[PDB]
């Protein structure tokens, strides 16, 4: 869920360089902020510290 | 990574969507197979094995 | 009147923190009401609702806002939406536009014959007062569905909050600056209501405490300009609006104390119907709270002319509340209500089939009976499963618990990272061994040592206009890299 306890917008991305939307793959997209789910494309192991 | 994609472009292996998830023994203690028992499904065809 | 028993109870209680005993010791004060005793409570609810509706009907611009909303819903030539269903639907002591015309023509006629006679001989003339009372008796015939009715009540609430906010701002600024007593303030605020003649009278009275007034007058007779704007937009006096608001407060307070007396005498029906619905789905205090919310929602829509008892009508609402509470979360995951309904239906059919036949509920007979496809039955039987907790004591000792046998697959192997670090240096040595411009093309083509991978048009805009020569360079690079002597160290990396 977007506003959830296991969310990807606030509580860290579940995968590296990938949105909750499932659209912002294909790594060429760098540093952009999504308009549907709003997940910043960062590296892994950030989910444990947010 | 783009290095492995460059290797795929040079050598030319398609690498289709079939994973190698066969049953392997981790640090396999060798020996002799006694008997193979296979369960079947009421809806799925048994397909020649049992 | 019952605290003397509760004091002797709490003298025995050794500080019990459990809210169940606490709840059923605070709710036991009010005894059971009689059968015909709530008829007078319902009549007080009737009197309060009628007083609030008379306070709305005495407000003259409610018809103006209603005609404005009716013009906005009538404007774009074709509407049969859900907003039209929120309108009147008049009750007696399926909506067509022909009856709307037939019942709104005389309403528009009374509006245009009432608006033109406002300036005739006075603001509160007796013939004009009879015309306002006649327009109010016409307006009380058509009563709204409470959605748009509560919308207009909220609009009147916002207008009242604006008027009382301006009046409170004036009063608090006067008390903060000049410190005026209420005896010299309330009389002038009741009497004058129009101009600054009370201000000139306060100047004409000597009153040496009022000498700190000239540096604040530029806000004093600026805050009254907003009241002049309100009187220009409305055309009403302050005292009549205060009387209407006081009658509306009384009509809300009577129904409020009636709801208090209803809930304090019917918490025990809620707990009696709620203690039989405690089948271990969730902790029952939330069920008690949801039953109280369902009691409130059943009291808010209770009728008197039916003649039946309130418990039969409230039972369906409180069972709906308990049903949506037990189907709201019900797990650690989110499952919709219709899925819970289908799972309960399949469980009852499987239980009846195991009772009749005597063996396991095979889903083929369920698919033949309920005419459902078999894969849908497999999907419903596969999704419905409760998750397992994170402790799960397996052995007898306190050593075997979880945090074991479960691994995380995100952390990958160090050997793969070592082969990646060797492959990086290998491709760096391959690109260094070739031509430097070939190395720059192979780096900026597929994204090696760059952030983004440039397309063919972007490489054409950067390096050179000819794009077929770039493909010839790529083909020559592939022909030079198919040689095994330059890729013998890369043939071992082919299996990965």
From Swiss-Prot, chain A:
Binding-site residues for Zn(2+) 1, renumbered to this chain: 19, 21, 34, 37
Function in brief: DNA-dependent RNA polymerase catalyzes the transcription of DNA into RNA using the four ribonucleoside triphosphates as substrates.
Subunit structure: The RNAP catalytic core consists of 2 alpha, 1 beta, 1 beta' and 1 omega subunit. When a sigma factor is associated with the core the holoenzyme is formed, which can initiate transcription.
Family according to the record: Belongs to the RNA polymerase beta' chain family.
Entry protein name: DNA-directed RNA polymerase subunit beta'
Organism: Escherichia coli O157:H7
From Swiss-Prot, chain B:
Domain of life: Bacteria
Function: DNA-dependent RNA polymerase catalyzes the transcription of DNA into RNA using the four ribonucleoside triphosphates as substrates.
Subunit structure as annotated in this protein's UniProt entry: The RNAP catalytic core consists of 2 alpha, 1 beta, 1 beta' and 1 omega subunit. When a sigma factor is associated with the core the holoenzyme is formed, which can initiate transcription.
Family: Belongs to the RNA polymerase beta chain family.
Entry protein name: DNA-directed RNA polymerase subunit beta
UniProt source species: Escherichia coli O157:H7
GN (gene name): rpoB
Residues shown, of full length: 896 to 945 of 1342
